[PDB]
Design a protein around this ligand. Structure first.
Ligand SMILES: Nc1ncnc2c1ncn2[C@@H]1O[C@H](COP(=O)(O)OP(=O)(O)OP(=O)(O)O)[C@@H](O)[C@H]1O
Ligand SMILES: Nc1ncnc2c1ncn2[C@@H]1O[C@H](COP(=O)(O)OP(=O)(O)OP(=O)(O)O)[C@@H](O)[C@H]1O
Ligand SMILES: C#Cc1cccc(COC(=O)NCCCC[C@H](N)C(=O)O)c1
Ligand SMILES: C#Cc1cccc(COC(=O)NCCCC[C@H](N)C(=O)O)c1
Ligand SMILES: [K+]
Ligand SMILES: [K+]
Ligand SMILES: [K+]
Ligand SMILES: [K+]
Ligand SMILES: [Mg+2]
Ligand SMILES: [Mg+2]
Ligand SMILES: [Mg+2]
Ligand SMILES: [Mg+2]
Ligand SMILES: [Mg+2]
Ligand SMILES: [Mg+2]
Lengths: 261, 261
């Protein structure tokens, strides 16, 4: 007997990377579904009994410890921001607008630029800060983009803002998480030349060595470096998820396990 | 010499609860401002050198540990939700709308209700879950309301869902944070009868003992208890802030210290 598309989709929802189950092995849908429901119930029961931590929250906490311990100040800035923060940043069709003059932030950079400028009046060189939190863009497009995702951005301004120090921070960070990567040359319209941090064909991060001409519009007038990483992409690599939706804030998956059981 | 309103406001921005400084003591504005700028720079320098943790993030982590250790599953659910989640919940003019069919969640309850229903199919009784994260309402109105604030909601469904267990969890929680409180009877249009958790005239939490008639609309069909707390109000009490804006996500204050230095 052959599986319908609806049946295959249901089994794919219930399958996890650790399974070694063939959906097209001739076993009827009913037995594959019952087997996978039992395994996923067991998996959630184990999480509930023994760990109880959300993957996104736990990764945020692990990242926070890494950067606080290396001298970076932890920032929590608004998610709902002025629409004016563009074209002050220079996408475009991807912005979720809110009322008339606001939007959901698509990136952390504008608030962090404001903090770098302000903190440089008070703190010793170099200024090192980071933020982790939700960002929003109109794009889902399958297995690597979410509309609601979680960004880490760290940055430094003053001394030590060289390409080699930027690459060394990225290397120490991804070594800490156990993720292999390479660095490639890329570009974008906001920052210009970028380094891209790649895991295979998956972009984990865009990183920048300043100064860039945009600095003047933000009152930034010292060398700087910084990088942005999406946490759901990190989780996708760490847990070998086929689709990034497994990693997202959602009511449909808990730690990559279907909640429809 | 007398201070203008603009001068008093500037000094109030720079004053912190720990100061014992009189703004109307006859000293000129210039010397009060210079003294307070020096103290606040020192304060930020100390944070940068020795702790580097954001107050909201650190409190989120402390709360997360408290509830995970007591058997509650940590949830991270979407912040951008369907507008349909009302009037399915039953405010009203306070919702930030996004595009046509979405809004910024004003509360955590609908996503947590969905998780309780789903998890009860997989997990043993009782089901215990919680979430911490941003919520949004159109109201600032001074010293106790923010438009972007951070909610803790914990809840339990099944056995043990009594008023006395709810009060005991609240008591253990606020004792852990070192915050005195009392419980009063209140009501609201969404849940009906509520307990209010009060610190003086400041509402820290609204809590509910189910079942309530709204349960049927969410597929909830067991006893339940739950409570919501605003983290910025907890921080306001803990740090004796005069205005809740000191506690909020912001680019204008870092851990209650003005960033305009
Ligand atoms: N829609 C999205 N969903 C999930 N993660 C994202 C999304 N957009 C960006 N990220 C993450 O944020 C990082 C920095 O993002 P940037 O601001 O450079 O976006 P990006 O270059 O458009 O990413 P991509 O080229 O894959 O669309 C990316 O490398 C990725 O890890
Ligand atoms: N605008 C806000 N700013 C900051 N915290 C809030 C806000 N609204 C609610 N909270 C917090 O969330 C808790 C639960 O909120 P609920 O959903 O009961 O709101 P609420 O009863 O309108 O609060 P209040 O009566 O003070 O307006 C409150 O007890 C408070 O701690
Ligand atoms: C404008 C501006 C600005 C000026 C100076 C300093 C900062 C600090 O902020 C940063 O760290 N920027 C780097 C983020 C890189 C990823 C980014 N989302 C991208 O689209 O490629 C910002
Ligand atoms: C509908 C529904 C629903 C049904 C069953 C269970 C839950 C679980 O969610 C909860 O814990 N609710 C309690 C929150 C109390 C504070 C609240 N913001 C207020 O406006 O007073 C929700
Ligand atoms: K598999
Ligand atoms: K999401
Ligand atoms: K004071
Ligand atoms: K805010
Ligand atoms: Mg993109
Ligand atoms: Mg790209
Ligand atoms: Mg990029
Ligand atoms: Mg209210
Ligand atoms: Mg109230
Ligand atoms: Mg209330």
């Amino acid at each position: 007997p052959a599986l319908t598309k609806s049946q295959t989709d249901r089994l794919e929802v219930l399958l996890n990377p650790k399974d070694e189950i063939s959906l097209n092995s001739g076993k009827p849908f009913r037995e594959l579904e019952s087997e996978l429901l039992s395994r996923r119930k067991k998996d959630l029961q184990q999480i509930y009994a023994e760990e109880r931590e959300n993957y996104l929250g736990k990764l945020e906490r692990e990242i926070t410890r890494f950067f606080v311990d290396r001298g970076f100040l932890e920032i929590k800035s608004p998610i709902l921001i002025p629409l004016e923060y563009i074209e002050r940043m220079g996408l475009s069709k991807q912005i979720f607008r809110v009322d008339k003059n606001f939007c959901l932030r698509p990136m952390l950079a504008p608030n962090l630029a404001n903090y770098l400028r302000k903190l440089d009046r008070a703190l010793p060189d170099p200024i090192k800060i980071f933020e982790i939190g939700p960002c929003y863009r109109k794009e889902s497009d399958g297995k690597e983009h979410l509309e609601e995702f979680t960004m880490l951005n760290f940055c430094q301004m003053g001394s030590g803002c060289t390409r080699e120090n930027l690459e060394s921070i990225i290397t120490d960070f991804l070594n800490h998480l156990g993720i292999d990567f390479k660095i490639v040359g890329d570009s974008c319209m906001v920052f210009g030349d970028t380094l891209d941090v790649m895991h295979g064909d998956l972009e984990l991060s865009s990183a920048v060595v300043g100064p860039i001409p945009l600095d003047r519009e933000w009152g930034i007038d010292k060398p700087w470096i910084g990088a942005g990483f999406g946490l759901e992409r990190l989780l996708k690599v760490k847990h070998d998820f086929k689709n990034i939706k497994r990693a997202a804030r959602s009511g449909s998956y808990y730690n990559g396990i279907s909640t429809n059981l």
